[PDB]
Every structure is written in C-alpha cells, then in structure tokens.
Amino acid sequence: NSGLHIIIFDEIDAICKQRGSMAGSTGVHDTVVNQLLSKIDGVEQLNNILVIGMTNRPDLIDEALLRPGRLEVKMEIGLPDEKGRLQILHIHTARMRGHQLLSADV
Amino acid sequence: MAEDADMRNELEEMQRRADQLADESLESTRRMLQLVEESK
Q: Domain of life, per the record (chain A)?
C-alpha cells in the first residue's frame, strides 16, 4: 500500500560504463556498477520505485543494465519538423500575445 | 615512446589516538589525594 519513490539520475554515463573497458580507476569505478545492479534488482523484492536516466551517448552504457526489468522504456528525443516548430513557437509567445505586447504584423 | 598518462590515488585511514580521558582521570586522582590528606 506504499506510494511511489522517484529517483532522477543525470548524465548516467559518467558513473556507469562497460565493465573491464576502463583501466587505471583504482577500482572505484568498477564496484559502483556492481552495487547499482545488485540494488535495482536483487534477491529481495522491491515494487515501489521508478528510475529515470538521461544521456547523450546511449551506446557506451553497460549492456547488463538495459535488459527488460531494469531500464525497459528507451526513448530517443530528436529534432522536430514543421508542425513541431509551429507548436514550439506557439508556447513561448503566449504571454506576449496576452497583454498586447506583440504587434499585429508578426 | 609510450609515456604513462600519470596516475591516480586511493586512501585508507586509521583510528586516531585522542588519549585525552587520562588527563581528566589524573586531575580527579590528584583531587582524591588532596581531600584524603585533609581528612587525616
């Protein structure tokens, strides 16, 4: 009956990377991944969390961290098209049109 | 040749030795001695 707990990681490819690829870290960069993996989905059961990650280099992240059950929904946020631009330009000039600060020519 | 990039370091501390309680014990004991001398 518990509520939801949300954790928002950021630049998730700064700590998580393919294991064994990096060298000279003194080991601190190869046990963090193990701890995170064991904690997201371990022998005990958790059913009230939600983890969000965002990054600019999708393919560097560890492969064992992306199978279904840990980070299922993968999405790409690409550039817009003409309709997308007409929409985006129509959100940022809403206030100006409200108080008649925007001329009738534009 | 191949010049090593450099290096990075890790740390592992150790317990400290305050050894400050013994001073309070010694002060208390000296007070013991003073009172004991006066009582006689």
A: Eukaryota
Elucidated via: cryo-EM
Q: Which residues of A touch B5 (CB under 8 A)?
A: 24
CB A93 within 8 A of CB A102: yes
| A33 within 8 A of A70, measured Cβ to Cβ | no
Residue A64 CA neighbour count, 13 Å, CB half: 13
- What's the helix, strand, coil split of chain A in %, to 5? 30, 10, 65
Phi, psi (degrees; rounded to nearest 5) at A59? -85, -10
Hey, is A17 helix, strand or coil? coil
Q: Which of B6, B9, B10 to mutate to test the interface with A (most CBs of A within 10 A)?
A: B10
**Cβ–Cβ < 8 Å for A14, A57:** no
